Design a protein around this ligand. Structure first.
Ligand SMILES: [Mg+2]
Ligand SMILES: [Mg+2]
Length: 95
């Protein structure tokens, strides 16, 4: 039921269950040009049931929206969607 990150054709695909449906949904991101803020906006656009979304470091520090997805994906992070927190573990890719 978690959030997964899987590279397909060289790009990260992030799959998540959103609050309003059981059908999981996947988001493909461009690491070098998309930011954290872009991903969060896509989540909100996909599900109007989302009131709150944010990404945190494993230590619980909020990640800036302008941070590139490539930088975020170098390590674990937390994704908060409404009242649920997901621990996300991306595969270690160089930089
Ligand atoms: Mg995935
Ligand atoms: Mg991280």
């Amino acid at each position: 039921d978690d959030v997964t990150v899987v590279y397909q054709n060289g790009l990260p695909v992030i799959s998540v269950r959103l609050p309003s449906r059981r059908e999981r949904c996947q988001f493909t991101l461009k690491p070098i040009s998309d930011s954290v803020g872009v991903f969060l906006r896509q989540l909100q656009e996909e599900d109007r049931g989302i009131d709150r979304v944010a990404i945190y470091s494993p230590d619980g520090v909020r990640v800036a929206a302008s941070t590139g997805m490539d930088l975020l994906l170098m390590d674990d992070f937390k994704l908060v969607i409404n009242d649920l927190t997901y621990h996300v573990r991306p595969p270690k890719r160089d930089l």
